[PDB]
Amino acid sequence: PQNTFLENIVRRSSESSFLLGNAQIVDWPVVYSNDGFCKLSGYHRADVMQKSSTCSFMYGELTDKKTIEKVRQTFDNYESNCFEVLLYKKNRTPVWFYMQIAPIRNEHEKVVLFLCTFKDITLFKQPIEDDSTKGWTKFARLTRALTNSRSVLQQLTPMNKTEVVHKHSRLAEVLQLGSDILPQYKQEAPKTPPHIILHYCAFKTTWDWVILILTFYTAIMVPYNVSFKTKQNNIAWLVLDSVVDVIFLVDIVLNFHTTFVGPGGEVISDPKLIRMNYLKTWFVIDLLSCLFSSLKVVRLLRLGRVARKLDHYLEYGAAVLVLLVCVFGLVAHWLACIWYSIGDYEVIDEVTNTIQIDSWLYQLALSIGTPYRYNIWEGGPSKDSLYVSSLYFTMTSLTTIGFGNIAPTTDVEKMFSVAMMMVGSLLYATIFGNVTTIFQQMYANTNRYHEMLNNVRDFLKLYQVPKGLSERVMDYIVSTWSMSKGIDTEKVLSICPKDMRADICVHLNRKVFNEHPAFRLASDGCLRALAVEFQTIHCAPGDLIYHAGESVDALCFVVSGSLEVIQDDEVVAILGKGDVFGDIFWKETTLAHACANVRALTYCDLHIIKREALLKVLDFYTAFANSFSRNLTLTCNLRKRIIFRKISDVKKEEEERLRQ
Amino acid sequence: PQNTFLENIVRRSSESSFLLGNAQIVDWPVVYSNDGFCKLSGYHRADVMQKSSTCSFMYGELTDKKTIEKVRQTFDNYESNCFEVLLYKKNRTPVWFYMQIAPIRNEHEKVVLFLCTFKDITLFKQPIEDDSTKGWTKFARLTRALTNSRSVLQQLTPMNKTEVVHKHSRLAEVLQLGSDILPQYKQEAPKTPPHIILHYCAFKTTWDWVILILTFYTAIMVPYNVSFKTKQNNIAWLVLDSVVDVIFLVDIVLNFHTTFVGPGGEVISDPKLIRMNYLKTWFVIDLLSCLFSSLKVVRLLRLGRVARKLDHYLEYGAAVLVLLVCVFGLVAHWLACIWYSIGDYEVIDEVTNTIQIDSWLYQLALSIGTPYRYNIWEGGPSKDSLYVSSLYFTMTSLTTIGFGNIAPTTDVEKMFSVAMMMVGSLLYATIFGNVTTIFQQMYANTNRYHEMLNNVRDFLKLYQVPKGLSERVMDYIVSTWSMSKGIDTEKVLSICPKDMRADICVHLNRKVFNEHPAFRLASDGCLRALAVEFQTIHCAPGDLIYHAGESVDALCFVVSGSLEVIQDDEVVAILGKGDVFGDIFWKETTLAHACANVRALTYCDLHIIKREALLKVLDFYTAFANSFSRNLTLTCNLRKRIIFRKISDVKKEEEERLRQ
Ligand SMILES: [K+]
Ligand SMILES: [K+]
Ligand SMILES: [K+]
Ligand SMILES: [K+]
Ligand SMILES: [K+]
């Protein structure tokens, strides 16, 4: 979903000098300048920007005031016209210009920009200049000013009294561009020329699936008709072939309207190139396949379409397995057809008029019960029995089972079965390799988890870590792999450079920004920085976050669970569900000693930010630092001690005081 | 094993304002405050904490002194009562409050906290105020003070003379909460509602195994009865089916009392949701299976339970192999049943009254010796021979052996055996893939070791490292892989963020803390820092730790073996089993030159700490730095030289002195 607007303007331009300027802002500042206006006026594309689009920076002394009034009025209310003005270049050279103001609409019909096309008509008019010494100086400059608009555009009548003709041509140009000057500045979808269908359309995929099914049907049925002679010839079967043939012809015609995917880029929608691409790639095979025994067997070339279209599916693992099973079936069928052809050729020698005992057809006739008769020769098995027998034999010989009811006994059958085995071994090996790769795909991840589990267990066993601490480590490993399922956040967030990382981190830390009053006067950039700098931790019951002597260097926000801050074996604070603790880092500049132990009661969830990152962020943004200081109050400051004296000690010391 | 105490209090609360305060500490400081007390008094949950739970910070001028005496007495000795007091909000607004003090017991019946529930009865009493100008000001505030306790709690009789009714309701509320106010603050185990059994209980796993065995039995026996017609019908077999059916009905009833595991969380024990979950997931299959040929064959739907329950076992590698072997056996049995059904249907055409020679049953009858008789038709093989023959054939066709005694010869048998082969190829490929994955699991680790071994050997051979140094490198590689078995401590310790790392490191370095007088006045935090900062090394006989010019930058503790410090080819120190050497880093601030070579005599073990980490730790903790300086004496200081003059030189120079 691009926003191709400059590309359309320059494609339509044919070497123009458009001067896109903003509309909603006062004075209509210039936003963009083509590198054709840098030569028509001498102003580079670094000072023309942010200047008024009324060309107030090129208005001089003898400029027409009334044209200034007209252009001011045209800019005032949104309308398009055409004017001829007399401006000055960077060298204070008087030059006549043609201006073609036109507004450009937004997505929902709003004026956003004002496109100002400029043309040069210096040689086409009389630019009277005062600082001249000879008459010829009034002529040569005309050739100097106009070079790409005289010998290129209007050179058929470059002689006098043609100025009115030039004005008429300019008027015709400006009148017949009603919709060409408004390309609808908007983020639109890709567009295609008429009578062109997208290769990824909803209709095209269904057409491709239909073509695949029909190609499979042809591959199944053509060898059967070639080998078993069919010879039924109904009217309910000769029309299906014709329907399939006309469908394939329709597909050949329709493939000329397909958007070829570019070499690493995106779709290409130029009919002058798609035709040539198809002709050079795959117009010979398609024509040959869709054109006697040879004419009817050449139709197996339709598998080229299946080979071409199966590229995205071949990436997967199960799709290759299904494809291999299908080709296994088709190969078995084709070998069955060849085997029956051999068996039919071998029986009944024609030089003599006897029947061969060697052929598998005669042995099959003995084993079924229907023998041959007559001596022309008639009898034998039915037409279904022959095909079922052939398929059964070629399936015994491809799966490496080989029962032995139907087996080669003639010289030709043996040297054909040798090739059958040579092909079948490779096919079977391919299937086995695909299956084992498919299994390894998932057992790789499972073994990756179990290897870490076993390594941790063996490390704990080796260094004789006492029971009660090994159990906690094992439970933590199991629990974290159950919760996260092996998905590491850092590896995923390393990808997607820092435009989606900030948004993802803001979403992850939404519970400490939405439900906390401190992060309420923060700009988007500051929130992005804080979100990418927090990181979060998960606790377990009994785990300690800070001990009695650790250095507090992180502000911790509690979003789930409950914490217990205990000092001198006495509970002094209970936290949970929206409490912040730690130390006041931004105004102390000294790491302190955690005065109390912070234990976890239930399964907690903390969003802790390190000291250095927080200080860096608060130093970069000044106003937010003041807001953060004013609006944040820690519910448990782990720097100062709470002074108290226990009741049991009071009662114990009272007795001693009474004694003395 | 959570400590859900606040959750129980807030669940029982029904929008109360409990004010949990400590008990063992004098004045009973407030520990936790609900975010319902921040509006009943205006005190935020940042200044109410660490204040006396006697509400001394809200006691005003006209507060009842006698109620103060009662609450002081109630806090003095551990007892629970209820009082009505007249307190002040943050805006000095007189407000009547109901206080419901109650102690909370520890695990072993000890008073720990004092829960003080508060209620507002402002509109329910007459709060006389002095700073008033009109009578109506005495009424509107009543609507302002009470909003969530008048229109929500008591709105059925909001008229005069109902104050006594309100007092009676309050007394009834306080009297009938004897056990609800004491949730036994304690780290307890998960609890379940009555008549609910844990899904991981010791009984549930046995029940699941029994159900698995019975499902396997049904899958084995139902097709046999369907296909071979059985027709024995004893009284010792019709009751086993009934017993299994009632057992499965009992299981269907009992599965309504199972704790479903939450989506990523832990068990869910709400009967109103487990029932709906079971009904939506798996109540149709279970009902259909446990309900003619169809009614007796639908029982194979019981395999859904096996499919569901086998999720944790499917992770392993050998369990999948056992499952695949079992399904191989069951598939062979089912194909045997189908094969016998086909063979029985084919023999003896019923249109005529003859016997078919094609069927495998007739060929089997010929090969055994028992033929068919009569022409109704009687004879043939026994009932055991038919089943053994069918199983043998379908096992020859699944293992890709295919002897050929029993093989398809009829049209139906061939087109059934084709499907048999199509299934068997995939099954056999699956088994092979599983086996090779299982082998690769362990050969991956073995090859990982051998690849490093070969790389080291080839690197030593390539750069022609002289013999006597390559041998030492190879011996070190072999010895360290024998001792550690490929278990890297750093990779294991990277996991388990810094709460178990400190404990593990303290345990690993226990031999330098317990058996050394220097680490005897160290707090837990300092020991944790030192333990996580040491790292340890293993030596070999002949290896040198420090040379004659290296920079000493580590304090080394010897815990096993013996060291030899030699200077000028003379032994000047022997160390071992509790000796510390190195340099005095904390008061020199200059890296020195090791004055002597420290060789290893036996297989040593050192716990060496780098200079930077030790200095950082000793700079963070001040008192421990003084204790460490006072209590540590190095047995071999590798900064100062020992001045000595050898005896052999004395004797040699004596002769020269006598000569001159
Ligand atoms: K075989
Ligand atoms: K294999
Ligand atoms: K094989
Ligand atoms: K065989
Ligand atoms: K045989």
Numbering used by the authors:
A (entry chain B), B (entry chain A): 11 to 301, 320 to 403, 408 to 692
Lines from the paper:
Here, we report six structures with near-atomic resolution captured by cryo-EM, representing human Eag2 (hEag2) in closed, pre-open, open, and pore dilation but non-conducting states. We expressed full-length hEag2 fused with a green fluorescent protein (GFP) in HEK293T cells and characterized its electrophysiological properties and show that it is a voltage-activated delayed rectifier potassium channel with a half-activation membrane potential of −10.0 ± 3.5 mV. The channel has a three-layer architecture: the upper extracellular turret, transmembrane domains, and intracellular domains occupying 3D space with a size of 130 Å × 130 Å × 130 Å. The tetrameric hEag2 apparatus adopts noncanonical non-domain-swapped VSDs, with distinct pore domain configurations.
The overall Cα atoms and the side chain of the two closed states are almost identical, while the differences are density peaks of the water molecule and potassium ion in S0, indicating that the water and potassium in S0 layer are dynamic in the closed states. For hEag2, in a closed state, the four pore-lining S6 helices form a bundle-crossing in the middle of the membrane right below the ion selectivity filter with two layers of hydroxyphenyl or phenyl residue, Y460s and F464s, forming the hydrophobic constriction sites through intrachain and interchain π–π interaction to prevent hydrated/dehydrated potassium ion flow. Below the hydrophobic constriction sites are hydrophilic constriction sites through intrachain and interchain electrostatic interaction of Q472s and T468s. The hydrophilic constriction sites together with the hydrophobic ones form a long channel gate. In the closed states and pre-open state 1, a strong and unambiguous density peak is located between the hydrophobic and hydrophilic constriction sites. The density is more likely to be a dehydrated potassium ion, and we name it site 6 or S6 as the seventh potassium ion selectivity site.
